[PDB]
Design a protein around this ligand. Structure first.
Ligand SMILES: *[C@H](O)[C@H](CC(C)C)NC(=O)[C@H](CC(C)C)NC(=O)[C@H](CC(C)C)NC(=O)OCc1ccccc1
Ligand SMILES: *[C@H](O)[C@H](CC(C)C)NC(=O)[C@H](CC(C)C)NC(=O)[C@H](CC(C)C)NC(=O)OCc1ccccc1
Ligand SMILES: [Cl-]
Ligand code: NA
Lengths: 302, 305
């Protein structure tokens, strides 16, 4: 029993982290096979942070302008290419620690683990979610760019996030590993802001099911709701719409607990109206929205 | 910026986890040098787990009774012994992935990372605190026994916890790597219960400093207090006493934020007596007590391993 914010074991990713320096800028890169992936803004100077022409900057670089360090070994860059906002440095040695891996672009509400790194070395691992406004609420300092987010269902590492920037509210933006930003953001220091964030309703419901599985029932009630009535209420609390896809997705947890999805929706309605009145759910005094239905099943059943 | 519950990178420990099978029980072992450590109750039975004589149960055991698997490779057991509640299986091969490590026993209020494993395969990592009642609030399913907790200090892994059991409230109990239980617990399926728990005051203060470092300042106030005065309030609300050593340990965060510990204690004193008035701190509506002062400094300064 028990329920924790759990990250994937980070060792398979640790073995891929390197340090990339261009000019006076150092950040992290991801070394897979004979390619190092990193944010393309490593090639910016203090002068072109607002409107960098990355194509023009990169054509001026020699391979020896990129210093790549894997632990105590310098890697030799033998070519480079830009893919959207990611730089791909070809090196003369394949990473012997390359795991089985793939690249996946995720949807809002999905969770993943982040291995926060500085100078190619890991500082720690934590769990994040892609917020509906396409930011993540990370923990990142100067030099953290190139840190990645990943999942490891089974024995294959799915890389889904590379860190690029921090926005004014202290939240974070980045790309998939094909270099496409999540959300409308750009790798320029022109004024940008995250949209109003909202709560990931389907994840809250998954977590309420986790609470029931772990033996807590105090928030249940005798009522049900229609889906449309639920969404009309939840939208008043800046909750995301619940779709029929989400209802289908919650079917298994519904079957395991004997609580119909729309009955659990009426519980959430009451919690939004009343709060917790001094009680907690799974050790929290707020409704938690960074566990997915898949996460709950994985942690509760295995 | 940002502040998350952050575990240590787990790679060094993942290379040490193996599967141990005895009879019909399978759980996890920790393979370091030429020894595999695991809970001694791996040798118990469906018909033998209420009042076990471990001493006598182990002599009937022999080496090939213990099936140890490192990934898809069997390790040959060449000896076995018991130390307190931990079994030590000597194997014929030293683990080539053994990190720099030591065994340590931690104090209540200290935090560590748990690498949750099943069938010898790491499945997840999360951060925990040794509660003042010597339980941990973990997440463990059947087959998780032998999962370990650890810290990393520079390049050295300090192993501090091995998982043995779950108590009726859904909290967890285990041993150090020398087999001594944390808390007044025994590896028997006899009636046991977690004692009443308390809140780890020095950790709450550290987390308030983390909040200030991240721009959450509403709870700061003009007042200061004394160690004596605050500790009476703490006692009243089931908070652990604040010692002078705690005050000194927070000193760095005190110097960097401008908020003396007794200045911050006055903030905490008011949060206890009055609550949070509907507000949140670092995204929580509760006072968080599973970050140590060291954890806050590490995360906010970007220490690496
Ligand atoms: C890479 O290590 C670093 C990580 C941060 C977490 C510090 N990223 C950057 O420095 C990044 C480089 C640019 C070219 C993508 N810049 C930012 O993230 C920057 C904040 C820094 C300077 C602390 N953010 C930014 O420019 O956001 C756009 C913006 C500009 C002006 C007003 C509002 C928003
Ligand atoms: C090892 O994988 C497993 C971990 C659990 C989290 C499943 N440990 C055990 O099965 C363990 C073995 C005993 C000899 C220490 N037993 C328990 O943890 C057991 C709960 C199981 C059956 C889920 N708990 C227990 O014995 O607690 C004391 C108790 C017993 C009966 C009544 C009150 C209290
Ligand atoms: Cl005063
Ligand atoms: Na004060």
């Amino acid at each position: 029993s028990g329920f924790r914010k759990m990250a994937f074991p980070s060792g398979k990713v640790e073995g891929c982290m390197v340090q990339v320096t261009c000019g006076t800028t150092t950040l992290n890169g991801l070394w897979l096979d004979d390619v190092v992936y990193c944010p393309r803004h490593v090639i910016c100077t203090s002068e072109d942070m607002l409107n960098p022409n990355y194509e023009d900057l990169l054509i001026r670089k020699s391979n020896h302008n990129f210093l790549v360090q894997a632990g105590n070994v310098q890697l030799r860059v033998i070519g480079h290419s830009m893919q959207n906002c990611v730089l791909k440095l070809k090196v003369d040695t394949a990473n012997p620690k390359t795991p089985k891996y793939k690249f996946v672009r995720i949807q809002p509400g999905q969770t993943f683990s982040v291995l926060a790194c500085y100078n190619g070395s890991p500082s720690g691992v934590y769990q994040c979610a892609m917020r509906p406004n396409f930011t993540i609420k990370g923990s990142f300092l100067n030099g953290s760019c190139g840190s990645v987010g990943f999942n490891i269902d089974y024995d294959c590492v799915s890389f889904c996030y590379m860190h690029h920037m921090e926005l004014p509210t202290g939240v974070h933006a980045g790309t998939d590993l094909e270099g496409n930003f999540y959300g409308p953001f750009v790798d320029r220091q022109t004024a940008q802001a995250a949209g109003t964030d909202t709560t990931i309703t389907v994840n809250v419901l998954a977590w309420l099911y986790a609470a029931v599985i772990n033996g807590d029932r105090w928030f249940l009630n005798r009522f049900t709701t229609t889906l449309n009535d639920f969404n009309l209420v939840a939208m008043k609390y800046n909750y995301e719409p619940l779709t029929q896809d989400h209802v289908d997705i919650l079917g298994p947890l519904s079957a395991q607990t004997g609580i119909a999805v729309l009955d659990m929706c009426a519980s959430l309605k009451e919690l939004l109206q009343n709060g917790m009145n001094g009680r907690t759910i799974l050790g929290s005094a707020l409704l938690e929205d960074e566990f997915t239905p898949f996460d709950v099943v994985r942690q509760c059943s295995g």
